[PDB]
């Protein structure tokens, strides 16, 4: 699991 | 799972 | 499962 | 799955 | 399952 | 699980 | 686990 | 477990 | 455990 | 661009 | 870009 | 850029 | 850019 | 950039 | 940068 | 940067 | 900088 | 920097 926010 | 928000 | 918004 | 929003 | 928006 | 905010 | 904000 | 904060 | 904040 | 191999 | 093997 | 093996 | 391999 | 092998 | 090996 | 092997 | 081995 | 090893 990867959650990214830019 | 992967989930990304630019 | 990939989810990605820009 | 693969999901995609530009 | 591939569901792409642009 | 990798969780990132920039 | 790995949680990053900058 | 590692969280960073910048 | 690490935990940081700069 | 969006390739998958199953 | 997103390339998936299974 | 997302590059997945499983 | 992210990369898995599992 | 994230890397991950399992 | 985040690299995991498991 | 984080790098961890376990 | 945060390196681990376990 | 922080480095362990276990």
Not at 1 to 6: A, E, F, H, L, T
């Amino acid at each position: 699991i990867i959650k990214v926010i830019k």
